[PDB]
Design a protein around this nucleic acid. Structure first.
Ligand SMILES: Cc1cn([C@H]2C[C@H](O)[C@@H](COP(=O)(O)O)O2)c(=O)[nH]c1=O
Lengths: 92, 95, 92, 97
DNA sequence: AAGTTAACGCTTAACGTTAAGGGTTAAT
DNA sequence: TCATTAACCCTTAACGTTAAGCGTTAACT
């Protein structure tokens, strides 16, 4: 009943489930602390690079993270520009 | 199939722009988008933005998410090709 | 509502003089995301940015600091004012 | 700003001289009253830490003072110290409109 | 004329760096 | 004991760098 930012999933399903702080996760992923923390704060998306890193580290699949992101981005784009795009583009 | 990932622009060409014989420039006028935007996607020099997946989904009567999935699988694959081996070397997997 | 300082910069200065975010950036000698993130209301005015904006627009720098300080006070009060009032009793 | 005009006044100076000494309150005791850790008050009193917006609210409620008073001291201090470090260089690279 | 595209600028995501505010712990 | 403060880490703001998506104006077919 809402589009879920991937950082929500990382925060509630992995970080808080495994009791891992953002800074600790960043050290294990070999990235800077803002890279993990901006995602967890729902202020950054999952890059292709971070999906590999997250899937490698948490055993999960990398596509899983990519799909979380692309669904979030599609829903975010739609709510923003959907009715306008539909008003200006006639199909076939 | 040569085990290379498929860029979405090749689908936009060989399965939509040639099937319906539509001009890159004509598609752009139809999508109310600039000409270089369509042309760069066709030319495999740009990815499918979320705005563009909505537009192609709407025009060509396909899912918008179909295009998003084509893009994600591609850029995941190309990121893996360019960095997966290094990423696997430096990250140990909590187990 | 608390007005973000970027709003006052976007609407009372950039729009009054038809200056793009990118152009202001070249004139202030900062990177383009530094001006653009202020304009988008995703970044506060730093003291260094208040000096640059004060110098460019012949305002005081304190003017920009006061916009920032009133904004971040309101923000912080909206985030924690009720809890802080609950947990602190005033001196008598 | 100082009377001699040669340095900015840090808000912790006002905190300890005009409130802590005026009321005989220890930094550690102020920390207990404000519900913050002891180094938070003590680093402000030692003029080693700025007043955050959260801390201005705590100080405002506790001392009946206004919270913006504390913000105003901090921003003037942060402006003055930013300007002494970089004002000339900013002045040379930015032509006004 | 109309489709392509190489140039150029604007906006803005992702990233590492640096630094500051904060709590904790423990030393003084 | 009780207050001060050092040392350390975590979270997060501001910043430059880089690169991607996009539109515009021109060259080119
Ligand atoms: C309309 C037009 C088409 N073309 C066509 C001819 C070919 O079909 C295509 C590329 O040719 P190019 O190589 O000379 O472009 C021009 O070269 N010039 C024009 O003005």
């Amino acid at each position: 009943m809402r589009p879920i930012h991937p950082g929500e999933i990382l925060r509630d399903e992995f970080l808080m489930e495994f009791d891992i702080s953002p800074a600790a996760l960043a050290r294990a992923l070999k990235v800077s602390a803002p890279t993990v923390n901006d995602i967890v704060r729902e202020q950054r998306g999952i890059s292709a690079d971070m999906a590999i890193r997250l899937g490698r580290y948490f055993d999960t699949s990398a596509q899983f993270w990519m799909n979380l992101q692309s669904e979030y981005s599609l829903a975010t784009a739609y709510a923003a520009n959907g009715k306008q795009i539909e008003h200006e583009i006639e199909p076939l």
